[PDB]
């Protein structure tokens, strides 16, 4: 039929379009016991499928650390900052501000069903969540927040699992 190259190209274009449109289908917000709000799948996702972008304010590490030192003065702020490496620098998606975007509401597990990856579009990095296994309708979406800090775990013991 088509070559691997053609299939990969057409797949990447579909992902680019989902990122650009901000379409966030197949998900609903629910209250999750012990976790606050979370996001539930309303349809099946297959392993490797695009689930959602982790969408918010893209900023650089120095700016992020400054914002965070201010947030730390107000214990009510909550933790919505997602730091990552892109090429030879470090960036952050700061999703502290409440929006209708769902990525920022997804909770943590070390044995979840989503994996975050970098998807750049013409030199602009995007953090996207991909299904790491098939996901059933009704499942809570979960991924590994990746914070191994002793101090973080002491204050947020749910990070342990």
């Amino acid at each position: 039929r088509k070559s691997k190259a053609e299939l990969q190209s057409e797949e990447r274009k579909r992902i680019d379009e989902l990122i650009e449109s901000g379409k966030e289908e197949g998900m609903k917000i629910d209250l999750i016991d012990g976790k606050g709000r979370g996001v539930i799948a309303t349809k099946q996702f297959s392993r490797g499928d695009f689930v959602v972008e982790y969408h918010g304010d893209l900023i650089e590490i120095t700016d992020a650390k400054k914002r965070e030192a201010l947030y730390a003065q107000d214990p009510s702020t909550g933790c919505y900052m997602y730091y990552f490496q892109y090429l030879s620098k470090t960036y952050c998606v700061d999703a502290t501000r409440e929006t209708n975007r769902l990525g920022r509401l997804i909770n943590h597990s070390k044995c979840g069903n989503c994996q975050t990856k970098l998807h750049d579009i013409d030199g602009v990095p995007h953090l996207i969540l991909i299904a790491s296994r098939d996901i059933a309708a009704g499942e809570e979406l979960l991924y590994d927040y990746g914070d191994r800090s002793k101090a973080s775990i002491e204050a947020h013991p749910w990070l342990k699992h």
Binding site: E68, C79, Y82, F84, Q85, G146, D147, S149, A155, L159
Partner: peptide, 9 residues
Amino acid sequence: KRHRKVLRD
């Protein structure tokens, strides 16, 4: 205190 969400290479 706070936790973070962190991705690395």
